[PDB]
Write a protein that binds this ligand. Structure first.
Ligand SMILES: CC[C@H]1OC(=O)[C@H](C)[C@@H](OC(=O)NCCCOCCC#Cc2ccc3c(=O)c(C(=O)O)cn(C)c3c2)[C@H](C)[C@@H](O[C@@H]2O[C@H](C)C[C@H](N(C)C)[C@H]2O)[C@](C)(OC)C[C@@H](C)C(=O)[C@H](C)[C@H]2NC(=O)O[C@@]21C
Ligand SMILES: [Mg+2]
Lengths: 112, 120, 48, 43
RNA sequence: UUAAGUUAUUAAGGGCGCACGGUGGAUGCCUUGGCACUAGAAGCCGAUGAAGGACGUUACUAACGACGAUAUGCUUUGGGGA
RNA sequence: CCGAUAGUGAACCAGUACCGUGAGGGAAAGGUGAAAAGCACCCCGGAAGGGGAGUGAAAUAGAACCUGAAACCGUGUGCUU
RNA sequence: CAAUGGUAGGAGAGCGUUCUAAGGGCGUUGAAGCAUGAUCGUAAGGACAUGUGGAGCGCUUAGAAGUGAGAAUGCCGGUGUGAGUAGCGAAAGACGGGUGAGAAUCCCGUCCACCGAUUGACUAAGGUUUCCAGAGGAAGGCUCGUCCGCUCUGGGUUAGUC
RNA sequence: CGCGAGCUGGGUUCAGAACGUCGUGAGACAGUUCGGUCCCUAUCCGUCGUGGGCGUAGGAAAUUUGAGAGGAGCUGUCCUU
RNA sequence: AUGAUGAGGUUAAUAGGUUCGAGGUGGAAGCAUGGUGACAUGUGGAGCUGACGAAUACUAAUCGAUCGAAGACUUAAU
């Protein structure tokens, strides 16, 4: 009834991916894929990938159909941040936090 | 008109180079603004080609770059000759147009709306 | 020219109410049935 | 601008370096402390 | 039906509670290592080239021990028991 | 007497990263499980990841690996505006 | 029957944390921690139940202390806000073909443009392997990256006269 | 003695120098004189513009009254009588 | 600034092009004549002409999709 797919430590800031995941929340699988493939943002290819993984998992493990599949819920939360520095002026150094993201998507057949 | 985010000399040069390349290939891929701005230049060159008198030839020589095309059977002829011998005939009866434009999706490196400008 | 105080979570989430991406202008393609952007050429088929 | 430390192998090994510290008793001292400390680069 | 009066609904977002996740490395439990001592050895090593090192040495190969062209060691006695 | 912000600076290739021309100065960093049994195959993906199946008492014990708090970031919503 | 605001401050009674002595106990039929709860005492605080947790820990009496943190522009470590804001470090690129999961950014080609007492060729000082050919894409490149001064593998410096 | 996170920096008030005066001297004088680095990416309130949401007991397109509010508001000379 | 406002989306002049014109510049090119040459003259107010005016669907506004009412109670006239 539910199928899971997760991408961990994706090299995109979670607040940047969340903008895109605020569109495919609760839409149908086909419409969701059409959005991702056409939204011109950076995170979009990495999330489309997760949707295909989720649908493949559903078909191959639960033998449920990929037409009545709505996106039960899809979110993204922080990951193991990488700390770097930028040489700024007058000998001072400022920090740069290269963040990451733990993308999760679950697709459901809307039943029990 | 548009400035294309560029100076005057660099734009003059870009527009004429893009027009030449279009004439060579008969359809190219570029961004919307530059397609919208090369449309007029290429259309006007074809007009200079629909007459073929020496004055219009000499005057169209201003814009086109000097390039060589290798046709089938290793036949060679330049952009002026193409314009005045292979494209004047095609549009002898059409009284405008000469070009179409087909918007395409945004590119990856930017959000630029790539398009294909083609000689119709 | 420096923040005199913190911007609480309430104020933060409030300011970004209007900060969002719009769903794409997508319509179904007449030759293949896959979605395409309106006024653009379908990238799956290559039509109009 | 000309900054400091214009490197030079010869002067580096002349003013510093094993044989220079072994030329004066005070030079012999710093090697003594550096071995007591267990240093790896002694001169 | 027309007047005059009253009152929802709304939630772009936000508040408070609740549930479920993430990051993060506190807490608890643990000890490879330390600290302070007591008792008994010992309390000088080098031109017989010392202390420290450098370069090496393995079947392959860098590091750390170990050992030096007889180089991941060689001879011998006594143990030694797969 | 200390139990990893303690106890040596150093429980871990530490007077080492590193810093300085040099004297010198000097860190951070322990914990899968009883056993490595360290996840045969299948599925999406170029890969990183993941989801099944299997190992195990346990895999929100899967190698960044015991417990896993708070700040902080999310996804739902009962009552509000 | 009387008294009970209180700062510097004096006096008294106590609650808690670690360890030790003894006695008596609890523990994979689930300890310590952790989280939740609408529970108890005058307070410091004490229990109980349910989850996670996978081995130690309470209670009584008495002893000792590295014994109680909210502030020291305290130290160390994490994470915020400013904010998807500033910045993206002097400059001319365009287009066809190819390569790939992916291309303004990599390879080839044409055109165009910049330097040219130099952004050209040598050679010193200094750096040491950055040199070359295959391969890769985590990280480093202020973007991307199939590319590289990056990573992996294997190679490369030959003098009687310099 | 409105206004420097709007501007200048001539005077004054750092370090240099010099003259007059005082001090044995180092130095000194609100006595002169020549010279002398003006940093800041705006969070909040405020203010000038410009959007979206919702409410106006149905959903809409256009024209509107005006409760209020703001802006103007100066004045010369010549001729005639 | 962006978003708004306004003119338009084929049953179409919204923009581009084409044709004509306004305005600007000032005598294009190639010829022929004359000059040793530097040049001059006629063709021919010619040639060119970004935003300005008009006509023309030649090219692009082709296809499509989303949102959007069914009208509360109370009392008095009705
Ligand atoms: C470029 C960025 C840096 O900014 C600055 O330099 C700016 C320009 C500076 O503005 C000013 O000069 N005054 C405004 C101009 C007034 O002229 C009148 C004529 C004079 C004089 C004078 C008198 C005595 C001395 C002195 O005795 C002496 C010595 O050495 O003994 C050295 N000289 C030079 C003196 C000169 C800042 C802003 C300055 O603050 C201001 O000073 C005042 C004393 C008080 C002001 N308030 C409190 C009323 C204050 O706002 C400071 C002190 O800087 C020197 C700022 C401090 C924080 C810094 O240090 C920062 C980090 C700066 N350093 C740097 O690197 O970045 C800077 C930001
Ligand atoms: Mg510097």
């Amino acid at each position: 009834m539910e199928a899971k797919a997760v991408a961990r430590t994706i090299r995109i800031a979670p607040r940047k991916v969340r903008l895109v995941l605020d569109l495919i929340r609760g839409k149908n699988a086909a419409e969701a894929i059409a959005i991702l493939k056409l939204t011109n943002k950076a995170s979009s290819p990495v999330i489309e990938k997760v949707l295909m993984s989720a649908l493949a998992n559903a078909e191959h493990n639960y033998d449920m159909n990929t037409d009545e599949l709505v996106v039960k819920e899809a979110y993204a939360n922080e990951g193991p941040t990488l700390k770097r520095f930028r040489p700024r002026a007058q000998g001072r150094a400022s920090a740069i936090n290269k963040r990451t993201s733990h993308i999760t998507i679950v697709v459901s057949d809307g039943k029990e | 008109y548009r400035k294309l985010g560029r100076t005057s000399d660099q734009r003059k040069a870009m527009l004429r180079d893009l027009a030449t390349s279009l004439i060579i290939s008969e359809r190219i891929e570029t961004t919307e603004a530059r397609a919208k701005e090369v449309r007029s230049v290429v259309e006007k060159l074809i007009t200079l080609g629909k007459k073929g008198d020496l004055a219009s030839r000499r005057n169209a020589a201003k814009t086109l770059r000097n390039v060589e095309i290798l046709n089938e059977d290793e036949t060679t002829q330049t952009a002026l000759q193409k314009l005045f011998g292979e494209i004047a005939e095609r549009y002898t009866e059409r009284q405008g147009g000469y070009t179409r434009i087909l918007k395409q999706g945004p590119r990856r490196g930017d959000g630029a709306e790539s398009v294909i400008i083609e000689l119709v | 020219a420096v923040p005199k105080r913190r911007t609480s979570k309430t104020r933060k989430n409030k300011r970004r109410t209007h900060f969002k991406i719009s769903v794409p202008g997508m319509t179904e393609c007449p030759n293949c049935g896959e979605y395409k952007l309106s006024h653009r050429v379908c990238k799956n088929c290559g039509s109009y | 601008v000309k900054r400091t430390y214009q490197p030079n192998k010869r002067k580096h090994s002349k003013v510093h370096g094993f044989r220079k510290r072994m030329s004066t008793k005070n030079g012999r001292k710093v090697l003594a402390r550096r071995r007591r400390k267990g240093r790896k680069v002694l001169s």
